[PDB]
Design a protein around this ligand. Structure first.
Ligand SMILES: [C][C]([C])[C]N([C][C]([O])[C]([C]C1=[C][C]=[C][C]=[C]1)[N]C(=O)O[C]1[C]O[C]2O[C][C][C]12)S(=O)(=O)C1=[C][C]=C([B]([O])=O)[C]=[C]1
Ligand SMILES: [Cl-]
Ligand SMILES: [Cl-]
Ligand SMILES: [Cl-]
Lengths: 99, 99
């Protein structure tokens, strides 16, 4: 699609067989999702947002579908106000900014 | 242009007679700029993201040139770690996300 920005660019994602709502976020290096159960081992990561730095759990090689497009990559799990799809997965689905 | 997302989508903006680097951020409702002076009236506001909330000054009807395109709208000024061009101005330059 071509998504305009008059409203939040929310899409449906599927991760662990569950549907969730998430925000397509070019200002996010990383994909970060609210607390949920994911398989495998995780690693610690610190990410800095507008209000400061937080600790999250980094899971690699996670299968995730974004607005119908299959991706497999790193997902951070932690206290984010909304699920955000960052550039690490936007690149996998071929997303660009255009004007 | 067409901006790939392998790296942060940083562009040069002109605001209040100063040049700054800023992120084209589809995840941001509003444009948020690091501390600077702007003319006219303002009111305080609180905005929240990852890491919590920060207090900002809200200036309305501010002109910004974004990668050579002029837009006008509200600008929030405060202790953001990165200058963010949010949807309120991304729409004005005709920016879309495409995949
Ligand atoms: C979280 C989003 C729902 C809203 N944010 C916009 C995001 O794009 C934000 C932008 C950003 C980028 C760098 C540093 C700080 C912030 N990136 C972000 O946190 O990314 C994290 C995950 O990847 C990492 O890489 C970048 C930081 C880490 S926000 O800045 O908090 C915001 C909130 C309210 C309003 B308003 O007008 O009400 C406007 C903006
Ligand atoms: Cl990844
Ligand atoms: Cl506006
Ligand atoms: Cl339009």
């Amino acid at each position: 699609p071509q998504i305009t920005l008059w409203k939040r660019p929310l899409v449906t994602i599927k991760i662990g067989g569950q549907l969730k709502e998430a925000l397509l976020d070019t200002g996010a290096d990383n994909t970060v999702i609210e607390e949920m159960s994911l398989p495998g081992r995780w690693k610690p990561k610190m990410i800095g947002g507008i209000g400061g730095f937080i600790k999250v759990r980094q899971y690699d090689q996670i299968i995730i579908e974004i607005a119908g497009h299959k991706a497999i990559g790193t997902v951070l799990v932690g206290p984010t106000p909304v699920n955000i799809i960052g550039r690490n997965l936007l690149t996998q689905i071929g997303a660009t900014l255009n004007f």
